[PDB]
Design a protein around this ligand. Structure first.
Ligand SMILES: C[N+](C)(CC[C@H](CSc1ccccc1)Nc1ccc(S(=O)(=O)NC(=O)c2ccc(N3CCN(Cc4ccccc4-c4ccc(Cl)cc4)CC3)cc2)cc1[N+](=O)[O-])CC(=O)O
Length: 140
């Protein structure tokens, strides 16, 4: 019912489309509110966005460790919607950088990592905080 997998796929498709790359359930109201919040996050936290984009040194064998290290740091002091939006933007940076560095094979892997983290680690918090509808109530 949270449909976190399709939320991830639609989000990553949008991020890759913004950079000119074509790649591969909840209301459009949720999908559009999330992508607008993520665009706004990265224009508000531009230095952070740019630093993350620059300092990722992706290879296939180390990309998961990069993902897991950053996500643990992001949620170390707990979960809030803003950090969830930052998590989506981070996955979008990892996907775009993968395509830029001729490692496009990583995009489907990163999408799986994101869906899995939502389902296994953020699911309880999302349900307890009123689901994706509550995200829209606050930030739509
Ligand atoms: C106009 N619009 C769209 C405004 C939407 C509004 C502002 S946009 C925004 C702002 C902050 C977070 C997300 C979106 N949204 C918002 C505002 C506050 C909040 S909130 O819950 O009070 N949280 C915060 O304000 C917040 C602010 C900053 C946050 N980060 C967390 C990430 N951190 C860098 C970082 C640290 C550790 C690990 C990774 C990173 C990192 C992660 C990703 C990248 Cl690309 C780069 C670095 C930088 C600071 C995290 C949360 C949440 C949202 N939201 O979820 O959409 C509708 C409206 O009017 O409400």
């Amino acid at each position: 019912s949270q449909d976190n997998r399709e939320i991830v796929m639609k989000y990553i498709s949008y991020k890759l489309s913004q950079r000119g790359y074509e790649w591969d359930t909840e209301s459009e109201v949720v999908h559009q509110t999330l992508r607008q919040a993520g665009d706004d996050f990265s224009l508000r936290y531009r230095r952070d966005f740019a630093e993350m984009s620059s300092q990722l040194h992706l290879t296939p064998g180390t990309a998961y460790a990069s993902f897991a290290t950053v996500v643990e740091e992001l949620f170390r002091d707990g979960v809030n919607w803003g950090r969830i939006v930052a998590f989506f933007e981070f996955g979008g940076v990892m996907c775009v950088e993968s395509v830029n560095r001729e490692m496009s094979v990583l995009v489907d892997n990163i999408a799986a990592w994101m869906a899995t983290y939502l389902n296994d680690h953020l699911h309880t918090w999302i349900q307890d905080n009123g689901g994706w509808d509550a995200f829209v109530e606050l930030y739509g």
